[PDB]
Amino acid sequence: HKIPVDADFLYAYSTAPGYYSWRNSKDGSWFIQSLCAMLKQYADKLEFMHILTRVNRKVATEFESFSFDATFHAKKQIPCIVSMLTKELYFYH
Amino acid sequence: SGISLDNSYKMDYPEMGLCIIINNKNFHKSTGMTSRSGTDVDAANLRETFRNLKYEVRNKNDLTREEIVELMRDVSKEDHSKRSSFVCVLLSHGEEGIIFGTNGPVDLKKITNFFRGDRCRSLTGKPKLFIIQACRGTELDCGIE
Ligand SMILES: *[C@@]1(=O)C(=O)N([C])C2=C1[C]=C(S(=O)(=O)N1[C][C][C][C]1[C]OC1=[C][C]=[C][C]=[C]1)[C]=[C]2
Fold first, then answer.
1. Is B80 a residue of the active site?
2. Secondary element (H or E) of residue B90
3. Does the Cβ of B92 fall within 6 Å of ligand 1?
4. Which residues carry this modification: S-nitrosocysteine (chain B)?
5. Ligand 1, closest atom to CA B133?
6. What is the CATH number of domain B1-145?
7. Domain residues for A25?
8. Is the Cβ–Cβ distance between B22 and B91 less than 8 Å?
9. What is the C-alpha separation between A59 and A77, in angstroms, rounded?
């Protein structure tokens, strides 16, 4: 009869907790760039979490920061899928 | 009928759901934060993408910590009865748990709470999706080659 009130929420974080979230002044953020790429290529093929997992590898493997400042030069990033959903999610039907 | 499984959300409601995108680019001299560049491409991108996903996109630029909250409180108050879901994209500066309005910080819980199963009746049982492009702190992943 009852269900958690925090149930059926999905949090797609661009980064692991505590880390920086990269953005490229020209092309956009790594995350949203990669999120839109994957959505259009699979929103009609994969279940949401499988999509976001492709989104995780795209970011992880294809991007790496360039910077005149050693501190911020050559950094990676891994988005964080946080799901409290109780059923699979397909944007199509 | 036949055996009825139900391992996936009913996504065949008359509408796919309204998608809110908050594009904060410019911050009040006071916050001591710089403008984010590239974000406008991000924002344009999501709109095109969610538009293809039959989502009713509403871009909302440079919102104050106050307007974010009202927006949310107001949107949550809407009747999402004929909708399958709800997406919400927050593009901004951040820290673990908070995303910055153009003047101050907003707690992720403070806004996603307007949509809790008991506070957004017409969305209970429906998937509420929050996409977050912002810092969750200041750590750097030097990675492993
Ligand atoms: C992060 O979203 C945040 O909350 N703050 C304070 C902040 C965040 C990210 C960025 S960034 O994407 O610009 N970038 C990643 C980490 C350091 C920085 C470096 O390059 C850069 C600097 C200035 C403009 C554009 C890119 C900045 C601040």
1. no
2. strand B86-91
3. no
4. 135
5. 2
6. 3.40.50.1460
7. 1-93
8. yes
9. 7
3-state class (DSSP) for residue B132? strand
Name the method of structure determination. Answer: X-ray
Q: Ligand 1 pocket check: which of B31, B36, B95, B108 to mutate, most ligand atoms within 8 Å of Cβ?
A: B36
Question: Which residue has 């008359």 as its token pair?
Answer: B14
The whole-angstrom separation of Cα B55 and Cα B51 is 5
Q: Which of A18, A91, A19, A1 is nearest to A51 (CA)?
A: A91
Distance of alpha carbon B85 from its chain centroid, rounded? 12
Atom 5, ligand 1: residue with shortest CA distance: B93
Amino acid at residue number A62? E
| Contacting B residues, span 28-87, partner chain A, CB-CB under 8 Å | 36-39, 41-42, 45-46, 48-49, 52-54
Helix-helix angle A30-42:A48-62, to 10 degrees: 140
> Which 3 state secondary structure label does DSSP give A17?
coil
At what resolution in Å was this solved?
2.8
